[PDB]
RNA sequence: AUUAGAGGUCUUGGGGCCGAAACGAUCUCAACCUAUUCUCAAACUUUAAAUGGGUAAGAAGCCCGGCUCGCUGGUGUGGAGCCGGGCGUGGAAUGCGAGUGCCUAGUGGGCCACUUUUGGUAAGCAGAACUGGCGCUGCGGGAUGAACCGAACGCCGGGUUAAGGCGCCCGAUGCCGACGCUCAUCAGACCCCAGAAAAGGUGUUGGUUGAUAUAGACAGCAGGAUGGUGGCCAUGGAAGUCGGAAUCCGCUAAGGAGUGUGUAACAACUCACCUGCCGAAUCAACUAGCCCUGAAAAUGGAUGGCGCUGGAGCGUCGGGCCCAUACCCGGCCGUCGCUGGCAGUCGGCAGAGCGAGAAAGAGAGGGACGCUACGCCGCGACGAGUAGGAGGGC
RNA sequence: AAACCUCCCGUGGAGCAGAAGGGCAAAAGCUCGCUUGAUCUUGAUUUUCAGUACGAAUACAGACCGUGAAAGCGGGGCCU
RNA sequence: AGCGUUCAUAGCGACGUCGCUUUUUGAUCCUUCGAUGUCGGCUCUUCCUAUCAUUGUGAAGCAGAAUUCACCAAGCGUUG
RNA sequence: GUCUACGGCCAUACCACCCUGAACGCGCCCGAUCUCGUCUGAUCUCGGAAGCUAAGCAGGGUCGGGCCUGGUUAGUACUUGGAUGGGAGACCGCCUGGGAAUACCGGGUGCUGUAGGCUU
């Protein structure tokens, strides 16, 4: 009473029913498995990021105004083009008032 | 290549794509026999790809025109050179015909090879159609029409319209 | 059935090429890899340690962790109707900087160049790659010469 | 000689049915919007598009349409995909409502965009529903084999205009 | 792995040969070596495709400025992490709204086909790869049929088709169909598919190649058809005829040194190469079409049947024509979608519009029906189904 | 013919415990010297895979050590 | 190729090769295990021809006799 | 033009034989007291500078081998997709696309980074 042993027959069809979903991409992937000695330093750089709070607010602000001076030192044919202007609602009102007197 | 209808003759020329390596390729003229010009330009690539290293992806058709007969009201003896394949090996042939246009002869050659040798149209490669005189003929089945005083009756006549008066009373005469 | 050995069927996958056996060139080591580089895998037989599996020989991924002699890669592996973004640790010897990315990085340079340039000219120039169009109408000069006539040759039994 | 421009437009008609179709072919025939037999569509030609047409060569019968061939298809079988709803084009304010952001405000504009493939073909051609052509009056030659070998599948370059006159 | 000769040298040697004896010499025969040469490899390979497998084609990106670090250090070096600010032509084509979480039945004997493929002589056998089928599925066609070809199904009217057909059964060629091919005392007659091979044919139709012809063919008829010689080494005799070797020439159209018709050999004659009359095609070998031989089983018998031979057969091909539940058009039912529309039935406290291509204001200084809103109404698209799941049952 | 000695040629035709394949020439081989990384301890990952184990394996990290002038290398066997 | 004095094919026919047949055995497991009564013989019928005899014939190494080989042919026989 | 040191690429750089090498340099070469190591100062280590391009090395040459790169083989082999194509089969032909490899015949025979000399 032997039987079949193995077959990948219906399988490729079975997989594409619900689609072969690519793995869900997302920014800020997890920091798991990264080596500890580099990670251990990285947590210290995040622990002492408040130390430069006063410098940073007093660095970009003086850089905020420095940007405000580089600006302050500076600041197919006319026939179908014409008919395209009469056919405009918001800016052709004054135009087609010339036709309204054409019946008059 | 399905030899359907009366064939025509086409002068199709082509060339390779222009490249910085070779400024302008040479032009290649052929004489294709095909039902429509579309299957002519396809049959063109089939020959040029075996006489040259050119394919349709690296060539361009330059002119797909139909050539007409120079004298369609003159009877002519045409000489055809074939390359057909049997069930066992390929052979060269020289078949002779008698018709009014070369395309009228090529069609006749395609029906004949299918009739006399059971060869389908995709097996035959016409390579040369030459107009020859009545003295350069070789096949006897066409030489017998070379007579300024040819004369022959019509023998026992296969009666047509045999269904229009389907139930007649008289025996149909066959001697006209 | 088959065996589940790690290197089953890698007679030619990890074998060194012809006339290239022996010590490996040193620029394969002094080539640097930051985080997030498009990096492909090609197993090298001469370095037994740090070898990847045979299912990644050819697969391309990105780096997420860099150690002394190795990198961690996030590569995709299809396993029976689903893709897995699995992390593997491979030595530098089985690693190349994939050039399947920089030709887009080159395209970013001119796209940033031609956007700043020609802006003061007030013109609008194309940026996107358009596929190869059908060729335009042109002439063909056939000066003097006539196109040569071709003919199918007869049959010569060559054997 | 004068080598004319290679045609920038093509009309694609599906000839084979839906039973027993290769998965690579089936994916392409639904990217050309040809889910039904004897459905038509316009396709602008380029290297990236012809190589998709080679994949479905046994299933389609495409060629280069004529100016009259576009007029009959848009007038008699033109249906706009307005809000994911197949709606007939019995009035110009159905086109200009949706295609007004591309200066297409009539049917002659819509034909001018399709026939002379412009820079707004994609929004124009995706606006038209796939054409539900009829069965070919007069009968095909052979549905199976390629047009060159007597059949009807493949690139029947200019003869596609004859096929339209009967199917439309 | 394997075949064959070549050219090398004593590079060792097998018996040799004048040599006591010598790489002194001898023809050699071997290996051995060097250029070549024939044939191969699922478990060989320098080369090496087609098809195929990843990745990329931006805003999570670019480009500035500055902080933090116990990490890294000649070097605010290196790298990472933080802030802050600036750049949208959305950076290939095509198509399409996506993401995501619960709970979960059935199933876990499969089978067939193109292509690839292992074992086996093979199998409607056993075992795999890829795709599609059947199972779960009707329909048109293949006479018949789980799987082949077409095409997938709500209920109908019209039109048109597919694959198949169109002498009759049997819808459609009752076409002034085309050009051939074939005669079978076993004709042949349409994928899967249901039956034949080597070999052969002066059957016939094509071809291929090489020779023969006014210096004359091929047959035909009629003439020399001898001779040294009746050759001898000779067998009793062979004188053209039992059996091998010499297998010439002069005369000269020419005569083989005798292929046949008989004795002991002749006589006898007709056989070669040539004469003639008559004078235009003929011979030789291959080749491939149809046809025939090769071809023998048990109930009576099967191109489906009848029957068909100016096909109703085979080959190449025409227009026409026939019809599926497929396609187009129209109706009706239902489901799905628009997460569509309607409380505006706002009436002498009235004034009847919001279908309008274009981000926004009909702004103030006496009158049918309807709307069980769990109701009513309008558009599109769609409809197979076992196991199984759910919903609704006036 | 084959003991030992010397020169020359020698891309691996050898060797590396074993089956085969891969790999290896100032070495992974051979020969010497010093040694115990075949030790102690978290996790992450790979392989089979249900993406569970066991086994085996790869990258680190924290220790204590070996060796080396040093860079380094070593937490068993060149890999399977 | 040879045997057959001579002589390939009257009759045979090696080395090879091409089939046919389902009266041998295999192979297979498709149908039947809520059963299809599983060896022979006896009895009785019909069918097949790959022909032993008989009718008609061809070929022989057929003189006659006897015996081979082949064709049309299964009508009729093939016993104690 | 070129060399030395350290290299990158790892034969267009290799191999065989022949030729020529100004200057510096690299070498050869002379020695063993010390350092160090051998059976042996050959090698390794160390101290030198009488000699020398003889060799290594560099450049060059060879109808050179190899290697590198083309042509040819060849649109051949093979192959994706398609047919109610052919064939008793074995297998072949066509449509649609992609497309090799020897023999054979050519061309080529190291580029180059950093530092330092020499030719002043």
Curated annotation (Swiss-Prot), chain A:
UniProt feature, compositional bias: Basic residues: 1-25
Modification sites for N6-acetyllysine: 32
Modified residue annotations for N6-methyllysine: 4
Full protein stretch here: 2 to 117 of 245
Quaternary structure, from the entry: Component of the large ribosomal subunit.
Record's subcellular location: Cytoplasm
Family: Belongs to the eukaryotic ribosomal protein eL29 family.
Function: Component of the large ribosomal subunit. The ribosome is a large ribonucleoprotein complex responsible for the synthesis of proteins in the cell.
Region (Disordered) residue spans: 1-32
Residue(s) carrying Phosphoserine: 30
Protein name (Swiss-Prot/TrEMBL): Large ribosomal subunit protein eL29
Superkingdom classification of source: Eukaryota
Swiss-Prot record, chain B:
Subcellular location: Cytoplasm
Modification Phosphoserine occurs at: 71, 123
Phosphotyrosine modifications at: 63
Family that this chain belongs to: Belongs to the eukaryotic ribosomal protein eL20 family.
Protein purpose: Component of the large ribosomal subunit. The ribosome is a large ribonucleoprotein complex responsible for the synthesis of proteins in the cell.
Subunit structure and binding partners: Component of the large ribosomal subunit. Binds IPO9 with high affinity.
Protein name (Swiss-Prot/TrEMBL): Large ribosomal subunit protein eL20
Protein species of origin: Oryctolagus cuniculus
Curated annotation (Swiss-Prot), chain C:
Location(s) in or outside the cell: Cytoplasm, Cytosol; Cytoplasm; Endoplasmic reticulum
Xref: InterPro entries: Ribosomal_eL21 (IPR001147), Ribosomal_eL21_CS (IPR018259), Ribosomal_eL21_sf (IPR036948), Translation_prot_SH3-like_sf (IPR008991)
UniProt entry keywords in alphabetical sequence: Cytoplasm, Endoplasmic reticulum, Ribonucleoprotein, Ribosomal protein
Gene Ontology biological process: translation
Coiled coil: none
Protein function: Component of the large ribosomal subunit. The ribosome is a large ribonucleoprotein complex responsible for the synthesis of proteins in the cell.
Region (Disordered): 111-144
UniProt GO molecular function: structural constituent of ribosome
Family: Belongs to the eukaryotic ribosomal protein eL21 family.
Subunit structure: Component of the large ribosomal subunit.
Source organism, top-level taxon: Eukaryota
A Pfam family hit: Ribosomal_L21e
Gene transcribed to yield this protein: RPL21
Full protein name: Large ribosomal subunit protein eL21
One term under GO cellular component: ribonucleoprotein complex
Composition bias type Basic and acidic residues, residue spans: 111-122, 135-144
Organism annotation: Oryctolagus cuniculus (Rabbit)
Transmembrane segments: none
Gene3D superfamilies: 6.10.250.3260, Ribosomal protein L21
From Swiss-Prot, chain D:
GO process terms (BP): maturation of LSU-rRNA from tricistronic rRNA transcript (SSU-rRNA, 5.8S rRNA, LSU-rRNA)
Modified positions (Phosphotyrosine) in chain numbering: 59
Annotated GO MF terms: RNA binding; structural constituent of ribosome
GO cellular component: cytosolic large ribosomal subunit
Record bears the keyword Coiled coil: no
Chain positions found as N6-succinyllysine: 47
Keywords: Acetylation, Cytoplasm, Phosphoprotein, Repeat, Ribonucleoprotein, Ribosomal protein, RNA-binding
Residues the record lists as N6-acetyllysine modifications: 44
Keyword match Cell membrane: no
Localization in the cell: Cytoplasm
Predominant subcellular localization, coarse grouping: cytoplasm
Superkingdom classification of source: Eukaryota
Role of this protein: Component of the large ribosomal subunit. The ribosome is a large ribonucleoprotein complex responsible for the synthesis of proteins in the cell. Binds to G-rich structures in 28S rRNA and in mRNAs. Plays a regulatory role in the translation apparatus; inhibits cell-free translation of mRNAs.
Record-stated family: Belongs to the universal ribosomal protein uL30 family.
Assembly description: Component of the large ribosomal subunit. Homodimer. Interacts with DHX33.
Listed name of the protein: Large ribosomal subunit protein uL30
Species of the source: Oryctolagus cuniculus
Name of the gene: RPL7
